[PDB]
Design a protein around this nucleic acid. Sequence first.
DNA 1: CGGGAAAATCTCTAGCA
DNA 2: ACTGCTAGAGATTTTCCCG
DNA 3: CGGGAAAATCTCTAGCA
DNA 4: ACTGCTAGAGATTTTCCCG
Lengths: 261, 242, 261, 242, 47, 47, 66, 66
Amino acid sequence: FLDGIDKAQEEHEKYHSNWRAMASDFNLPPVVAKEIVASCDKCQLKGEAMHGQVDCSPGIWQLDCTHLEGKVILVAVHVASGYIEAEVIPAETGQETAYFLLKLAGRWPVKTVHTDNGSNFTSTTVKAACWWAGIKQEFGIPYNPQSKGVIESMNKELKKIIGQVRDQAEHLKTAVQMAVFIHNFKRKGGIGGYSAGERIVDIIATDIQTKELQKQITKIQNFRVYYRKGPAKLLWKGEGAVVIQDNSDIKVVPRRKAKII
Amino acid sequence: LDGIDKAQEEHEKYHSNWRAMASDFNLPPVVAKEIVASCDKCQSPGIWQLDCTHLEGKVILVAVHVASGYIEAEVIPAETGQETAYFLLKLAGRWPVKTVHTDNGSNFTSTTVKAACWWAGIKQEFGVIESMNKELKKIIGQVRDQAEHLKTAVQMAVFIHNFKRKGGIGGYSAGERIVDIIATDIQTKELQKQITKIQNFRVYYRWKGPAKLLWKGEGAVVIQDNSDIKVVPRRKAKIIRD
Amino acid sequence: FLDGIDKAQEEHEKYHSNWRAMASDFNLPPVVAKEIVASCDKCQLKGEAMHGQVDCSPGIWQLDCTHLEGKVILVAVHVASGYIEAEVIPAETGQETAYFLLKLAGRWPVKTVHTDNGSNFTSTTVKAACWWAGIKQEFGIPYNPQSKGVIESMNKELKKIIGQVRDQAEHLKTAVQMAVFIHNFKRKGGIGGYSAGERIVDIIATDIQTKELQKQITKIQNFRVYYRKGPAKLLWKGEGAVVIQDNSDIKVVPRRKAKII
Amino acid sequence: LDGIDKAQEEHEKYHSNWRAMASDFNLPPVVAKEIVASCDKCQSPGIWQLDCTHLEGKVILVAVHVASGYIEAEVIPAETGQETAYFLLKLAGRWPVKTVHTDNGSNFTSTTVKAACWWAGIKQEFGVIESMNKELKKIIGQVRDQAEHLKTAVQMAVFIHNFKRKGGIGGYSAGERIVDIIATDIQTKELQKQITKIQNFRVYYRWKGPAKLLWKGEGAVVIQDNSDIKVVPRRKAKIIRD
Amino acid sequence: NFRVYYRDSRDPVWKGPAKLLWKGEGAVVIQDNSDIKVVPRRKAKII
Amino acid sequence: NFRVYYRDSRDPVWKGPAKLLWKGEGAVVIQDNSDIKVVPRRKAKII
Amino acid sequence: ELQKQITKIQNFRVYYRDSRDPVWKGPAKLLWKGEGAVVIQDNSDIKVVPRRKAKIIRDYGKQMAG
Amino acid sequence: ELQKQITKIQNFRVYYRDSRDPVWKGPAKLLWKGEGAVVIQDNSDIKVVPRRKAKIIRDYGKQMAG
DNA sequence: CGGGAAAATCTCTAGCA
DNA sequence: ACTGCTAGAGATTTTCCCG
DNA sequence: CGGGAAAATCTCTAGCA
DNA sequence: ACTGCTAGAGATTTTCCCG
Ligand SMILES: C[C@@H]1CCO[C@H]2Cn3cc(C(=O)NCc4ccc(F)cc4F)c(=O)c(O)c3C(=O)N12
Ligand SMILES: C[C@@H]1CCO[C@H]2Cn3cc(C(=O)NCc4ccc(F)cc4F)c(=O)c(O)c3C(=O)N12
Ligand SMILES: [Mg+2]
Ligand SMILES: [Mg+2]
Ligand SMILES: [Zn+2]
Ligand SMILES: [Zn+2]
């Protein structure tokens, strides 16, 4: 195919044909044509077609600012549950964001906050507030709103609800608080058929309960399991299978070839 | 199924509530609730207390969840009805508030607060509060130097009180206690919903007279009749709505 | 449920709860809660989640204008094949669009053109050109780019190719013509593993060939089929089934209960 | 499969090309092509003609596809190399142009046209053209009154010539004829590609000597050996690359 | 008869209810106040 | 070693090739000219 | 006479879509062509498809490769 | 003692996602919880899921409806 | 009838004012 | 009474190749 | 074991600077 | 070394109800 390879390369240096065109027109194997395309710097103009997945630990909160009727609304969401908080703030300053986050931390167990690189979220005042409250700040990839999709979606949802209750309030702060109330306690759905408040209560209570229960189980049930190795710690034996943890690797093995001491 | 009679014996002797019976004997909550409701020998989460604190010439509105002692306190620009209504609306949007107790002040009586409570479905009624309001002042005195403005110090004190102070029987914090209490109330509300849904049915078994349905399992039907709980096969019972 | 219905209606007039919330909180059947939500004018804020499908007859062309480096490019696409034409025009006027469409009609069998409501496409000159050339103009729903998705996508594609060949030309018109060449004859894919030019040639030739072949078949094969009715025209008998056309309704019937005369 | 010998008999007597044999006897095109290529007794779509026409003080560049007589004509502002190169690039992007014949004019010889042809892979060589160029002028005279400018009249005449004038053996139009011719050339190119791909293989059957592969079917393998075409079972033959 | 709630054209606010005059695959024709309009089925809800 | 071609941030023009320093699920860390950058895997291609 | 034309018209391939399925279905076998509808044979299933939703080709690459 | 706690921890429900599947998988059975990983039992299949991809609830509606 | 390799198909995303 | 699509990058499923 | 009806799940889209 | 999501509208698949 060598001569065909030279003709294909010369043709691609002019037209930048895709691999199918050069495979058809020069009798090339598909791998050769794909290699010719992949060696061209001018043809790499597309990324892989997939999305990532945001973290969903019970302590993760996503914060954003939205705008409505010339007013600024600072909105935080609990990723696990969909529970929201929202405040109409006079300006997008570090002081207001720091106050909002400090008040949020004193009402729920906030561990990390996920925000974009807006000037209010990256101020030294917000940094000091997070340091005092023991909150870890996570700005992801700059100018990548998808990394905050949850809060972004909540923005949409929040504004939608405001459009339904704006006539019941005389001021936008009242309508925002009404919308927060309605989203948190008057809309049911999701994993458990819950509202956001019910779901967040379930998430936090489950976290503490399971942590204490597993602490008790590990304190009482102490065993060493040998499979195929060293003294791996027993995690869960049952249903003809043993889940163990050998060298920071939680692995599942069949009940066979496993001795428990 | 096999533990129903054991559950009745346990309640007759030890008088255990339905949750303990359902945990120990593995019964559906409706059956244990009806067992404990059949003993004539036998027979709060949604209440908050509001108050105002004056410190350094500024007004702090403090709401205490009394079942847990959970404090939500905000510095407000003026002691007016609008600020109180806004604070109550925020509180109701954050937590399931059903009742608030106030000291019949001018701000707590205004029509704006009444309208906010009516919209949010909150009932208004005119030493936990004092104890928590004094502990909050103590913490504010401790952490005043760490902040410039009073509002930041108040929120820092609220954070410390809710999550950094621990005590009681189990050594939990106010936040932990309030999540436990609210979860228990959610369970209570779901059980009440299940009982209300089930109560509109009647069962004919073996046919005998009308009977009260308790549980509709996969291969069994637990009913009550003549103050006695019996489990019958699904095919042997007919359920109608009345 | 009547009392529960009044409580649910009163609660929804304030919070506008979704059907699940009112079903849970008022012991309502799901249909009753859904009816309560569906009777609220303030809750109808979402359309059905589907897309339409554009026409794909062999005579359909989609025309659009795109902009690049301050220049205007008028781009037409043949929907069936993906074959494109593109011209750099001095201005977005009715004269230029009419000239472009008249030249396109004289080179390919253009039957209908699908354009948006831009001022150049809705001018009286373009209307007169289409009337003379026997072209039917189809503006769809105003401000609905999806109805022209094909041409819109081609815009993207065209610009992409231009970005790969802009360094080989000194003027944008030359680069545009190079991009048209590359798209039409140097990119293979789609249904038949074709290029756009090969595919359009196949589409047009297949159209004429099948039309003449079916004309001959219908001229020679004349039969009347009675099924279950009147004298339905026979379309295709074979494989234990008969396709017929009774009263402008082409229907398939089993070979049983069908007599051919 | 059964019609191979009948195909050889038909070509020996009637001397039919491979397409007719493949249509009548249902053979893969490679087998019929090799049948017609084995008869030593036995043994255009991509060419265009360019010209310029001067009318009413303006220059019209006319390209004629001679296999069909298909006209593509545009009024150009000036008879320069840049305009000719732009016209050729448009033509090559619209149709599969491989050869253009020009009358060795100043514009057709310029380096810009040479560069455009080199980029587009067009070969340049220095009574169809005259006949079509006179018919175009006749149609322009007919339709001049229907338009104000000359370019619009020229495009109207091109439309009428390509799609509204019919003639020849089958009564087709120039557009119809050019699509048929280009489709036939696409078929020719695909058959050539298939033959080129297949020719790099050798087959051992029944083992006999090396043989030329023709077709690789689902349950048969058609090969040639000693100027005779035979079909052998897939399991009975081994194919290697040399 | 049907009720149609629609979003007409680059306007985020939803209108309705409107009478459904015609239904097709991908679009509908509505009469919202002596004003016949054509709306994509993506931007409409029929009850 | 790998070659990375990426679109960095609100810039339609693609850069590259860059050395891949780290690969994760949903993003990558690239060094394009003594300039360490983090790019979503939607905006990158690794060869 | 007729059988040859019928086989020829059955030699054409059809790609089509359904009213609510956005993906294109494979090369069905053409059985009948009309002004508005096309009758096709896809995987032992005889269907009637709108002409607006059908791309009818021959596929000259496959025709030359038996 | 231990068996009661193990049954209680198995009473919890887990919703999870895989590294490249955007849809949420149903309420698996919790078997073990750790700092970084969770061991679950979904449809006779024992899996290890990152803690970052797991929502662990109890579902109080189902607990009250046996 | 069966593994390894290759071809084919499925899934999914950006960009198109 | 009109209507999202298209080309490429991985990932997974199907087919082929010779035992 | 089986139709009709209802509940549950799947598919898919706009909007979020 | 970090990462689209969410709630609602149809459409289709599963389960339940009483013979
Ligand atoms: C100046 C700060 C810091 C740097 O970036 C800018 C610009 N920006 C743009 C969007 C935005 O594009 N929303 C539409 C959207 C698109 C896709 C998606 F997945 C999610 C979406 F919300 C925001 O929401 C947002 O907060 C910002 C912002 O805050 N800033
Ligand atoms: C003044 C004329 C007449 C009336 O409408 C305006 C505005 N407009 C907007 C886009 C546009 O939104 N492209 C992005 C896009 C979004 C979604 C999708 F499915 C396809 C897409 F291309 C166009 O392409 C376009 O030609 C126009 C236009 O021409 N006009
Ligand atoms: Mg945002
Ligand atoms: Mg456009
Ligand atoms: Zn290239
Ligand atoms: Zn409503």
